[PDB]
Ligand binder design. Structure first.
Ligand SMILES: CCCCCCC/C=C\CCCCCC(=O)OC[C@@H](O)CO
Ligand SMILES: CCCCCCC/C=C\CCCCCC(=O)OC[C@@H](O)CO
Ligand SMILES: CCCCCCC/C=C\CCCCCC(=O)OC[C@@H](O)CO
Ligand SMILES: CCCCCCC/C=C\CCCCCC(=O)OC[C@@H](O)CO
Ligand SMILES: CCCCCCC/C=C\CCCCCC(=O)OC[C@@H](O)CO
Ligand SMILES: CCCCCCC/C=C\CCCCCC(=O)OC[C@@H](O)CO
Ligand SMILES: CCCCCCC/C=C\CCCCCC(=O)OC[C@@H](O)CO
Ligand SMILES: CCCCCCCCCCCCCCCC(=O)OP(=O)(O)O
Ligand SMILES: CCCCCCCCCCCCCCCC(=O)OP(=O)(O)O
Ligand SMILES: [K+]
Ligand SMILES: [K+]
Length: 193
């Protein structure tokens, strides 16, 4: 139906606004030059400082949270509308429709989707991320581990098949976007903080 289609397209368009690009050009920085050349909060931090990375993290978080919250409240956590809305937000971050935006890895946006479903599951997944990051100082290893953990937490918390499907497909896409990070991790050559 039309309302579900509207929300899903809105989520994709909103997700396509990679805010790292918005703030990096705002002070003249070729984000694709600095650091790793990525648009996510991690390279924003590396290029502009921690304060700007946190702002980008929150903005990229909100473009997952806001459409998914609308889906939760308008259709239900058990609705496949939520499934496709959350996926659309993350796909927009990864494959932005706007010609001049390059995609990111979707981790902050995916956390926003999870938080709209269950703040508890999201906070536990973020604790996994933080613990892994403090342990080894690899952002990629923390994002991969916490992405898998979010699926396990949603499963043990009893969330339904449409949510688990959403989490498995989003998690597969996130891990695919980390394929070069994984090759570096396998040979001890990942960039360390
Ligand atoms: C390139 C354009 C991006 C968007 C492409 C189209 C998105 C695909 C599907 C949107 C509708 C999903 C409906 C899911 C569903 O069964 O909802 C229950 C009901 O409300 C639908 O009539
Ligand atoms: C479910 C949302 C939970 C998030 C609440 C707190 C949000 C604040 C910051 C998020 C961005 C990542 C922060 C990582 C961080 O502080 O790393 C510190 C690291 O440099 C070692 O001290
Ligand atoms: C449900 C809670 C899960 C919390 C995380 C526990 C899962 C176990 C391990 C996380 C990944 C550890 C990877 C260690 C490793 O060999 O990293 C590569 C190494 O070269 C880094 O120094
Ligand atoms: C190895 C250490 C333990 C790791 C965690 C393993 C599982 C731990 C806790 C699961 C508790 C889930 C409580 C929520 C739950 O199932 O609620 C069902 C209910 O919310 C349905 O409305
Ligand atoms: C090292 C492993 C640590 C594991 C810690 C596990 C404790 C985490 C969570 C406790 C679950 C609380 C119950 C949540 C709950 O009932 O929420 C939903 C539902 O019951 C509402 O009807
Ligand atoms: C990088 C890896 C990405 C992999 C993506 C794979 C996507 C796989 C399968 C798509 C299955 C769509 C199922 C739709 C569905 O069950 O709709 C529920 C329906 O009851 C709504 O009324
Ligand atoms: C809860 C499940 C977490 C899964 C995390 C998977 C992370 C994926 C790839 C990282 C590969 C790490 C590099 C392997 C490596 O150095 O192995 C040596 C290792 O045995 C030392 O502990
Ligand atoms: C199911 C998902 C569960 C996700 C659990 C882990 C969430 C970690 C968030 C904190 C880290 C955020 C900073 C990395 C983002 C970035 O640099 O870039 P993007 O990936 O955004 O392009
Ligand atoms: C670095 C180590 C970090 C270790 C963290 C591992 C512990 C997680 C246990 C699973 C808990 C998941 C269930 C949430 C409860 C729920 O159902 O909540 P509501 O959705 O009803 O609000
Ligand atoms: K990278
Ligand atoms: K593009």
């Amino acid at each position: 139906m039309g309302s579900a289609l509207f929300l899903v397209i809105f989520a994709y368009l909103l997700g396509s606004i990679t805010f790292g690009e918005v703030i990096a050009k705002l002070k003249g920085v070729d984000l694709r030059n600095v650091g790793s050349g990525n648009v996510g909060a991690t390279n924003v931090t590396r290029a502009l400082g921690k304060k700007y990375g946190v702002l980008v993290f929150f903005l990229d978080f909100l473009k997952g949270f806001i459409p998914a919250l609308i889906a939760v409240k308008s259709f239900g956590i058990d609705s496949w509308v939520l499934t496709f809305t959350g996926l659309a937000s993350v796909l927009g971050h990864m494959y932005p429709v706007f010609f001049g935006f390059k995609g990111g890895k979707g981790v902050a946006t995916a956390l926003g989707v999870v938080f709209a479903v269950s703040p508890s599951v999201a906070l536990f997944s973020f604790l996994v991320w933080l613990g892994i990051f403090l342990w080894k100082r690899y952002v990629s290893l923390a994002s991969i581990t916490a992405t898998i953990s979010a699926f396990l937490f949603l499963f043990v918390a009893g969330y339904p098949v449409n949510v688990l499907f959403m989490a498995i497909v989003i998690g597969a896409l996130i891990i695919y976007r980390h394929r070069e990070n994984i090759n570096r991790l396998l040979t001890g050559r990942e960039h360390r903080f």
